[PDB]
């Protein structure tokens, strides 16, 4: 029936508790979605080649060239935190919970409305929007994960974060195969090193279409489509962070002489000459036992050739690393590599009353200290005669290849059978919730984009389209653009994401850090006088935990 509703709008969050300190977090999110008809109905193969920008020596990092297939379909992506939780709910989860699991995911399209536009062309402009009761919305749930997986969070193109603001879906595309070469240069190189695009090798060509791969459901103004509950198989996420680095693993040394009064200068003292200390160290050619040299079970965190760019068939990319700097929490200028930087707009946090195309940005300084401080590292000759002479220590200040601003730490890697490192923390609201595991024989230990990674398979994507509303002058033999009636669809979307979380327990005499409203952050969680809203980033691993 045209005049009957097919679904209920619900954006509530429910915390049903259970025995043993577990809570089932069911987060319902609903949105009003606005979809126009695609610019064209044809699958386009398009190439980007920013030769002008990259031809300038030393700008190789700015390479954007690639190949993609532009489809007539739009993607509905709810794989971002803000789609599901409001600031208060996040406060609750992060302050009261210790671990978080992923359980299930549903979504449905209900109350489909299709409308057509007529413009009068009269000297005083005017137009009319008319209903099209027989028009249809094409819906295709890629339950088998046949299409390439394209998580919209990386581009900040997911659904919106406010229930009361309608949201649009994103034009869907996927990568083609391009062979591209770009020899790096500097401001000072002669001429122009090779910046060439080669094309496609026939053995890597994959032209997917939704129509030929997924069932298509033709929803009229009175139909509905429900995906069906999916159940996850991810590993747990932790809402607590580790402070213990290698220097803090194990039993401290006994202090044979202790302070006798309170004072900034009243330090303690181990009390035994260093070459006379009992203990165990891996450095077999010295008798000095020191906090820098005493054995530890393993390595917390690892060093990587940070800002390494590595070239493959498709061009240079930045070597991703798991965690960022240590101690950067006290200075934003030292965010450096590892810690992500999010750029986003008014659907996803930026003060909705801001003009212009500049996006709000934040860098997410993590709470966990599985990091490194390169300026303090040093490699010294094996002899270990101390104090070390100029020739027997490589310092972070020394040149590599004669480049005064490239030190050994930039080409350094300390990852081994001993590396203990943690998973990435969730980033509210612009972070990703889940990701698909690569279909490679040997798989990565973690993803840097999402906390939850999927073992076997996980939820299929949803693609939407407006059916061809042909005029009476259609002619499939015509080479011109197909003449369509301008049509657009507004359909409601409701999703349900179920989480399982554990309630934390107080383990220490002292209070721990929590997210709290204060006279500084106050106006970030209430609308402006003219009605503008924003969502500021929030931490997720405030509570510390014991690594060892």
């Amino acid at each position, epitope marked *: 029936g045209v005049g009957i509703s097919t679904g209920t709008f619900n954006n509530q969050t429910e915390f049903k508790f259970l025995e043993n300190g577990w809570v089932y977090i069911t987060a319902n999110s609903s949105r009003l979605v606005h979809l126009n008809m695609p610019e064209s109905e044809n699958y386009r193969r398009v190439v980007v080649n920013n030769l002008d920008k990259t031809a300038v020596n030393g700008n190789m990092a700015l390479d954007d060239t690639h190949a993609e297939i532009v489809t007539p379909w739009s993607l509905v992506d709810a794989n971002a935190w803000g789609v599901w939780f409001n600031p208060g709910d996040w406060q609750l989860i992060v302050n009261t919970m210790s671990e978080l699991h992923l359980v299930s995911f549903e979504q449905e399209i209900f109350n489909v409305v299709l409308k057509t536009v007529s413009e009068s062309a009269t000297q005083p402009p005017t137009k009319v929007y008319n209903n099209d009761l027989t028009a249809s919305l094409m819906v295709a749930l890629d339950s088998n994960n046949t299409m390439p997986f394209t998580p919209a969070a990386m581009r900040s193109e997911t659904l919106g974060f406010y229930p009361w603001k309608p949201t649009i879906p994103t034009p869907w595309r996927y990568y083609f195969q391009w062979d591209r070469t770009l020899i790096p240069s500097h401001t000072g190189t002669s001429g122009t090193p090779t910046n060439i695009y080669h094309g496609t090798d026939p053995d890597d060509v994959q032209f997917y279409t939704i129509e030929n791969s997924v069932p298509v459901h033709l929803l009229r103004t009175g139909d509905e489509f429900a995906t069906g509950t999916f159940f996850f198989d991810c590993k747990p996420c932790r809402l607590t962070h580790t402070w213990q680095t290698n220097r803090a693993l194990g039993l401290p040394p006994f202090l044979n002489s202790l302070p006798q009064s309170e*004072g*900034g*200068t009243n330090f303690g003292y181990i009390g035994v000459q260093q070459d006379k200390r009992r203990g165990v160290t891996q450095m077999g050619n010295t008798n000095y036992i020191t906090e820098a040299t005493i054995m530890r079970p393993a390595e917390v965190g690892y060093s990587a050739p940070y800002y390494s760019f590595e070239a493959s068939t498709q061009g240079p990319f930045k070597t991703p690393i798991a965690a960022g700097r240590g101690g950067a929490q*006290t*200075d934003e200028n030292q965010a450096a590599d590892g810690d992500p930087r999010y750029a986003f707009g008014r659907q996803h946090g930026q003060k909705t009353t801001t003009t212009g195309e500049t996006p709000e940005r934040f860098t997410y300084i993590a709470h966990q200290d599985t990091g490194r401080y390169p300026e303090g590292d040093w490699i010294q000759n094996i002899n270990f005669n101390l104090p070390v002479t100029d020739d027997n220590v490589l310092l972070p200040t020394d040149p590599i290849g004669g480049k005064t601003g490239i030190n050994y730490t930039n080409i350094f890697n300390t990852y081994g059978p001993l590396t203990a490192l943690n998973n990435v923390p969730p980033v509210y609201p612009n972070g990703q919730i889940w990701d698909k595991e690569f279909d490679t024989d040997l798989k990565p230990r973690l993803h840097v984009n999402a906390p939850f990674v999927c073992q076997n398979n996980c939820p299929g994507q949803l693609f939407v389209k407006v059916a061809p509303n042909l005029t009476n002058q259609y002619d499939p033999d015509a080479s011109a653009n197909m003449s369509r009636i301008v049509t657009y669809s507004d359909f409601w979307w409701k999703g349900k994401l179920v989480f399982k979380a554990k309630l934390r327990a107080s383990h220490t005499w002292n209070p721990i850090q929590q997210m709290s409203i204060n*006279v500084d952050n106050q106006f970030n969680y209430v609308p402006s006088n003219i009605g503008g809203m924003k969502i500021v980033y929030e931490k997720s691993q405030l509570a510390p935990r014991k690594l060892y």
Partner: antibody
Amino acid sequence: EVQLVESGGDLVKPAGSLRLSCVASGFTFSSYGMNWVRQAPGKGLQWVAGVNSGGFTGYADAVKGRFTISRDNAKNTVYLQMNSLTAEDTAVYYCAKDRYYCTGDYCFNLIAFGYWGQGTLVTVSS
Amino acid sequence: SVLTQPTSVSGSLGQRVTISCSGSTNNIGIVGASWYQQLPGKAPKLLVYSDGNRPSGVPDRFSGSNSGNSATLTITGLQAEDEADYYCQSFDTTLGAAVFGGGTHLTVL
């Protein structure tokens, strides 16, 4: 860039008290210690006091037990209550901030650096 | 405690000049000197850190050195604008207090 401002210096009678104020902007006031340094007309420098983020305070013997320094982290403001002033305290007073972030009791109040403010003059006489 | 300094020093335009400061194991021998410059009637501005580095915008002319219980500052390419009073600074590890030197006046000829 780091900016500091000071106020409260004035001519005052011996004994009694006087209260200086220094304000800051451009840097994370919480993570850095704040110090006062003074210089008499045409004479050398002399560190007065410093206060780390946690409320722990330090003083030089010339004032230890006479002055009391403090912070208001919510306003990037530091205060120096100068009780029991004497003629020898006549000097110009400057507000400084250490280079390296630091907090707690064991934290050196001032090692090397500070974008010293314009300063405030103080005279004790009657 | 206090750091010793020379009373005054002189140098000709375009020539190099040196200034010295002396301390003890607990002030200079542990934490290096930091050199400050004070213009007439103005608040002092630092020249060289104990780290050996200079703040942003400080001319390359200045540079510092340290040896045992003493430190030293030098100016290369002395200029007329460099005529100012100078002070060494350190930290007495025993008293936990910043120790400033006696000051020195540099004359440009």
